[PDB]
Amino acid sequence: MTGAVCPGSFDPVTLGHLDVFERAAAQFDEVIVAVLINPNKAGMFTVDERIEMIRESTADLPNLRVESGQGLLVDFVRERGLNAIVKGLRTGTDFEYELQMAQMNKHIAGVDTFFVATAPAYSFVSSSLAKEVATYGGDVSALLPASVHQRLLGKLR
Amino acid sequence: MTGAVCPGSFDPVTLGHLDVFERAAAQFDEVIVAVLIAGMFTVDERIEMIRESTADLPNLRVESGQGLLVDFVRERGLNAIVKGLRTGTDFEYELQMAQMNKHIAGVDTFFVATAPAYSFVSSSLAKEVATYGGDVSALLPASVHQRLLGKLR
Amino acid sequence: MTGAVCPGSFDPVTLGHLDVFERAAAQFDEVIVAVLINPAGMFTVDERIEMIRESTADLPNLRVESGQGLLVDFVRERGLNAIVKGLRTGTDFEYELQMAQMNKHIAGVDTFFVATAPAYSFVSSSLAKEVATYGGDVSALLPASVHQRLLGKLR
Amino acid sequence: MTGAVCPGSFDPVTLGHLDVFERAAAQFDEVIVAVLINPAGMFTVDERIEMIRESTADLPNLRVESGQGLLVDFVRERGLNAIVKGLRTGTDFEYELQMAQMNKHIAGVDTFFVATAPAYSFVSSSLAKEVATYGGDVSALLPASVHQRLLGKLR
Amino acid sequence: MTGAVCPGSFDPVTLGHLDVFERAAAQFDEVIVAVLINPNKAGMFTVDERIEMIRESTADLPNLRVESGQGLLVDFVRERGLNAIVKGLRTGTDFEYELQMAQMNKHIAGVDTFFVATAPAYSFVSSSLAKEVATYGGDVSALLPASVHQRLLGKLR
Amino acid sequence: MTGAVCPGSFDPVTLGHLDVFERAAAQFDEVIVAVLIAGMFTVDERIEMIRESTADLPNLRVESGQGLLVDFVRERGLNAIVKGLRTGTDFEYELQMAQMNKHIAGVDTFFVATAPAYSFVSSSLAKEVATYGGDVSALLPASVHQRLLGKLR
Numbered sequence: 001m002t003g004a005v006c007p008g009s010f011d012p013v014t015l016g017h018l019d020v021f022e023r024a025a026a027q028f029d030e031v032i033v034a035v036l037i038n039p040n041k042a043g044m045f046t047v048d049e050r051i052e053m054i055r056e057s058t059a060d061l062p063n064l065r066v067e068s069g070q071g072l073l074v075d076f077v078r079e080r081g082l083n084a085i086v087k088g089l090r091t092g093t094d095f096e097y098e099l100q101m102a103q104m105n106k107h108i109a110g111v112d113t114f115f116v117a118t119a120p121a122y123s124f125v126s127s128s129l130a131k132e133v134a135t136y137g138g139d140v141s142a143l144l145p146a147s148v149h150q151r152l153l154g155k156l157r
Numbered sequence: 158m159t160g161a162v163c164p165g166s167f168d169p170v171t172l173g174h175l176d177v178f179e180r181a182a183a184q185f186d187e188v189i190v191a192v193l194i195a196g197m198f199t200v201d202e203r204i205e206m207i208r209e210s211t212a213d214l215p216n217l218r219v220e221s222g223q224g225l226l227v228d229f230v231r232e233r234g235l236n237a238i239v240k241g242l243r244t245g246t247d248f249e250y251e252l253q254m255a256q257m258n259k260h261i262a263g264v265d266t267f268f269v270a271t272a273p274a275y276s277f278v279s280s281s282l283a284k285e286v287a288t289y290g291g292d293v294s295a296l297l298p299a300s301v302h303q304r305l306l307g308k309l310r
Numbered sequence: 311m312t313g314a315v316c317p318g319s320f321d322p323v324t325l326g327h328l329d330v331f332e333r334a335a336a337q338f339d340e341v342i343v344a345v346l347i348n349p350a351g352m353f354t355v356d357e358r359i360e361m362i363r364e365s366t367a368d369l370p371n372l373r374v375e376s377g378q379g380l381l382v383d384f385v386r387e388r389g390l391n392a393i394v395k396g397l398r399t400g401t402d403f404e405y406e407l408q409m410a411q412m413n414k415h416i417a418g419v420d421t422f423f424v425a426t427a428p429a430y431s432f433v434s435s436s437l438a439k440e441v442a443t444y445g446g447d448v449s450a451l452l453p454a455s456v457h458q459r460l461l462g463k464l465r
Numbered sequence: 466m467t468g469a470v471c472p473g474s475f476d477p478v479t480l481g482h483l484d485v486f487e488r489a490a491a492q493f494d495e496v497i498v499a500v501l502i503n504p505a506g507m508f509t510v511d512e513r514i515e516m517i518r519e520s521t522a523d524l525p526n527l528r529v530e531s532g533q534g535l536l537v538d539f540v541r542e543r544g545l546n547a548i549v550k551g552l553r554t555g556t557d558f559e560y561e562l563q564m565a566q567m568n569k570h571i572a573g574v575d576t577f578f579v580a581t582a583p584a585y586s587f588v589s590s591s592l593a594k595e596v597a598t599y600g601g602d603v604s605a606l607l608p609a610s611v612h613q614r615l616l617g618k619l620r
Numbered sequence: 621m622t623g624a625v626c627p628g629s630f631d632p633v634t635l636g637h638l639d640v641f642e643r644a645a646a647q648f649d650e651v652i653v654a655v656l657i658n659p660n661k662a663g664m665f666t667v668d669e670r671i672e673m674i675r676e677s678t679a680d681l682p683n684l685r686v687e688s689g690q691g692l693l694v695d696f697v698r699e700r701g702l703n704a705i706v707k708g709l710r711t712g713t714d715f716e717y718e719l720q721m722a723q724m725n726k727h728i729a730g731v732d733t734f735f736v737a738t739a740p741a742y743s744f745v746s747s748s749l750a751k752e753v754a755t756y757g758g759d760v761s762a763l764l765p766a767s768v769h770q771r772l773l774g775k776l777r
Numbered sequence: 778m779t780g781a782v783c784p785g786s787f788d789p790v791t792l793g794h795l796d797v798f799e800r801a802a803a804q805f806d807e808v809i810v811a812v813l814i815a816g817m818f819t820v821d822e823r824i825e826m827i828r829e830s831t832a833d834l835p836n837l838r839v840e841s842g843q844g845l846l847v848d849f850v851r852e853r854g855l856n857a858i859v860k861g862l863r864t865g866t867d868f869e870y871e872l873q874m875a876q877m878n879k880h881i882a883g884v885d886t887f888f889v890a891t892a893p894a895y896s897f898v899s900s901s902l903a904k905e906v907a908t909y910g911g912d913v914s915a916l917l918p919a920s921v922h923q924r925l926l927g928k929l930r
């Protein structure tokens with residue numbers, strides 16, 4: 001009955017994210033992808049769009065499910081009877097801030113955070129940089145799942 | 158006649174800040190906490206909370222500041238800054254400012270890491286966690302914590 | 311059935327190590343602590359294993375074994391393909407990242423990193439030995455049984 | 466025929482920037498300084514270009530142009546495929562690395578990094594403006610013509 | 621008449637090195653790979669072996685040549701009428717030490733150092749880690765040029 | 778009665794070290810340079826070179842040390858260390874030692890960055906460059922530089 005939560009805004013999900021989802025699904029009995037929403041700032045994609053893009057690119061992972069949430073991550077985790085977070089690392093990750101949040105999350109709720117580095121091929125993509133590059137016409141098709149790329153181009157046009 | 162300035166926004170002051178205040182006060186004759194000024198607490202409130210938390214430090218005082226930090230320091234006859242380091246400190250930016258401050262006014266900056274127990278609190282993260290109901294009472298002075306609860310509720 | 315290996319020299323095991331062991335044992339069905347030996351330290355391999363077993367008596371899904379050679383072979387030979395490594399102040403994280411990417415490339419093994427608790431974040435096996443050698447008190451940073459043994463090796 | 470682009474907002478150009486411009490112009494047959502504009506600063510694009518040209522008068526193989534949109538398009542449209550970026554204290558190097566790897570992936574453009582001289586390592590456009598705003602003397606960190614103009618904008 | 625020196629011990633050359641050689645050869649009129657030797661510590665490969673492995677994997681680069689040296693890098697550079705170094709970055713590079721050496725080299729000889737990050741695929745290989753992995757039987761064949769791999773296995777057996 | 782210890786191997790002392798010595802001496806009543814002990818110069822030689830370079834600092838003295846640094850500090854009635862930062866400093870290890878030293882003996886560590894001009898010299902790199910004929914005369918006290926040339930030639 002092991003389990004972990006993979007949190008993020010996923011606006012949109014990238015292949016860097018999916019790599020980490022796959023590793024978590026391979027190493028824990030259940031994985032919940034937590035799409036965390038700030039109710040005070042809209043992203044590019046609505047919550048239902050974000051979830052649909054993740055579901056479409058994780059259909060081969062039977063022990064992974066996707067849910068949205070807001071507020072404290074550790075409450076989302078604990079209310080599902082879990083106490084582990086799995087977070088990806090990429091080039092440009094603010095690791096010091098991730099460490100700060102991990103120590104805080106352990107302090108307030110006893111939840112552990114496990115970090116895993118994404119594959120080198122996917123290590124320089126981020127949701128924000130992919131959106132920025134695509135906005136100005138750059139080809140990011142190789143860094144995003146098919147469930148995302150043309151939806152992204154659609155939002156931009 | 159030694160002295161140092163401990164600058165920050167302190168909105169609110171944390172035990173991380175207080176730990177560094179205490180070390181500065183133990184190692185310099187005179188310490189001034191500089192409250193540099195759209196946050197949660199007003200300047201006077203921040204000052205009050207720091208004074209309340211530092212009552213046991215006879216050689217420490219608290220003042221608000223505006224403009225160049227080095228001017229704040231120099232206009233009080235000093236030329237040392239003591240700055241704390243915590244998890245999530247942008248140290249590269251701190252170093253840039255330290256070299257700039259030395260260049261323009263001959264003021265030295267001394268960095269000291271806060272205690273491990275208080276190394277992951279920041280004013281911003283404490284407010285965020287408290288806003289969503291998390292317990293940060295172990296990370297703030299007793300007075301501050303009650304005051305924070307007040308601003309929220 | 312999930313599982314991970316926690317590798318190190320553990321010469322001696324510290325409370326920083328133990329914290330990570332505990333978190334691994336809480337999150338994986340099986341944990342193996344791999345005591346890695348090189349061609350050299352203060353404690354023998356058997357002594358190190360003994361100290362880890364004493365400190366992890368409450369962890370029934372964790373076991374301790376010695377290992378030699380390629381870490382990913384150690385992992386895969388036991389039917390696992392995850393490594394859990396702790397992070398502390400002074401960890402060469404860039405080198406850990408290099409090794410993690412290498413280990414994934416050559417054997418498909420994943421590496422999960424977890425930061426030890428702030429209280430145990432500045433202890434290391436090497437620094438504890440150095441401080442103890444010159445009479446510093448590191449008893450709050452080591453398991454009780456380890457601290458006793460350490461004094462013995464030094465006196 | 467070799468060449469590189471040196472991109473930035475240069476609002477205003479600093480001696481840190483100039484040092485890197487000089488090194489680029491010494492090592493490549495052609496250098497283009499790309500003054501990048503966003504939807505916002507102290508100096509207009511034309512003012513920035515003017516200040517860079519004043520400061521680089523002795524560099525005949527360097528020219529200054531404004532740019533918008535995708536940096537790698539700016540580079541490739543001028544028949545080049547190298548970027549030269551400076552490093553200073555406070556540079557977000559991890560983000561620079563991310564962008565370099567992205568820029569290589571999407572367009573085949575290489576990025577070369579060079580550290581500015583220690584004397585100019587703590588100036589940035591933003592910090593110079595901030596210090597000057599409150600009356601600090603940054604004249605040793607900026608070209609003479611830039612310092613004069615800066616005082617003007619503030620007074 | 622532009623030019624740069626690409627320095628290292630190259631014991632052995634890796635695909636991370638070759639990527640940087642290729643980028644330097646594409647951006648400078650001439651590139652000299654400097655095989656720097658400590659006369660007080662032998663590596664795994666002799667200087668002639670190192671040079672031969674580099675030459676064999678750079679035959680498609682007409683403006684690159686390979687030479688060995690010792691002592692101060694900036695003397696090697698300046699005695700060839702050049703004043704640029706091109707150095708690669710990978711995962712595990714001690715960048716702070718590289719920066720220190722770059723500032724020192726500029727101070728004492730006026731030589732500039734340009735850093736370039738190796739491709740993600742080659743970002744976790746190093747000569748030392750490749751030797752270590754191969755020593756204990758791990759497969760590093762995809763991280764080294766053909767001119768190296770079996771020579772490496774030969775040294776190890 | 779303020780004071781700090783500046784520890785290192787100083788083999789030899791550089792202008793980077795001296796810059797930090799000067800700042801420590803300007804901000805603390807009493808400074809002790811601790812020469813901690815197979816290098817190029819003997820302990821006495823290192824001490825001599827530092828004394829010669831710090832003659833203008835009346836409140837600074839130089840002593841050799843062995844064993845725990847915190848014992849050196851505490852046995853002199855102090856509990857502050859001042860440590861310089863340069864390009865290539867292993868800051869993560871410095872932080873580990875600082876937290877350890879606070880834990881075992883209540884000694885604080887204050888870090889200060891050396892001036893940009895002296896930020897890329899280290900004892901080791903200065904010796905290496907000088908060994909192969911490079912000019913490091915701008916990076917070392919005049920006395921030290923001549924002494925170094927002597928050891929080489």
Ligand SMILES: Cc1cn(CCC(=O)O)c2ccccc12
Nearest residue numbers: 007008009010016017020087088
């Ligand atoms: C690579 C990576 C980034 N993040 C942050 C996610 C975000 O903020 O959108 C992750 C979260 C979970 C798993 C992997 C990752």
Ligand SMILES: Cc1cn(CCC(=O)O)c2ccccc12
Nearest residue numbers: 163164165166173174177240241
């Ligand atoms: C722990 C800590 C952080 N900071 C900066 C906080 C800020 O810049 O607002 C400090 C400033 C003075 C003393 C201690 C600290």
Ligand SMILES: Cc1cn(CCC(=O)O)c2ccccc12
Nearest residue numbers: 316318319320326327330395396
């Ligand atoms: C905190 C920590 C350090 N290391 C490596 C230390 C060593 O090599 O002995 C670990 C290995 C496994 C779990 C936790 C840790």
Ligand SMILES: Cc1cn(CCC(=O)O)c2ccccc12
Nearest residue numbers: 471473474475481482485550551
């Ligand atoms: C020192 C330095 C900073 N940057 C970016 C600064 C900016 O974005 O304005 C550079 C760009 C080109 C060459 C040198 C530099």
Ligand SMILES: Cc1cn(CCC(=O)O)c2ccccc12
Nearest residue numbers: 627628629630636637640707708
């Ligand atoms: C990736 C990389 C590492 N290094 C150090 C070389 C070494 O020390 O063997 C390089 C040197 C030149 C070009 C690229 C590289």
Ligand SMILES: Cc1cn(CCC(=O)O)c2ccccc12
Nearest residue numbers: 783784785786793794797860861
């Ligand atoms: C610049 C600098 C480096 N270090 C450490 C050198 C060492 O640890 O040997 C210092 C120690 C005291 C004062 C200044 C410095």
